[PDB]
UniProtKB/Swiss-Prot annotation:
Protein name: Large ribosomal subunit protein eL30
GO MF term list: RNA binding; structural constituent of ribosome
HAMAP family recorded: Ribosomal_eL30
Family membership: Belongs to the eukaryotic ribosomal protein eL30 family.
Classification via SUPFAM superfamilies: L30e-like
Length: 99
């Protein structure tokens, strides 16, 4: 089974992830992300925009069970992270979350 925290960090360290709604949308429009992860408390309209642009490109979206605080903490940040895009999974199995 995917250990979310482990594989997310492994993606961050060995691949390429980009943090935040703005960047997540940009990558979604260009079809540049392989997965978008949204915190469960991401702003409703932002979550909906992400889901929309991801759907246009066939990019899977995964909702993280925790808050933007918990997601930021997982990513080593002292601030909230509401969404992120996995551009390159590196050596990780994070993309299995796309189903």
């Amino acid at each position: 089974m995917v250990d979310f925290a482990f594989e997310l960090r492994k993606a961050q360290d060995t691949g390429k992830i980009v943090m935040g709604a703005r960047k997540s949308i940009q990558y979604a429009k260009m079809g540049g992300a392989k997965l978008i992860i949204v915190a469960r408390n991401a702003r409703p309209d932002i979550k909906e925009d992400i889901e929309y642009y991801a759907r246009l490109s066939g990019i899977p979206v995964y909702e993280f069970e925790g808050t933007s605080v918990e997601l930021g903490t997982l990513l080593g940040r002292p601030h909230t992270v509401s969404a992120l895009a996995v551009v390159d999974p590196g050596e990780s199995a994070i993309l299995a979350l796309g189903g």
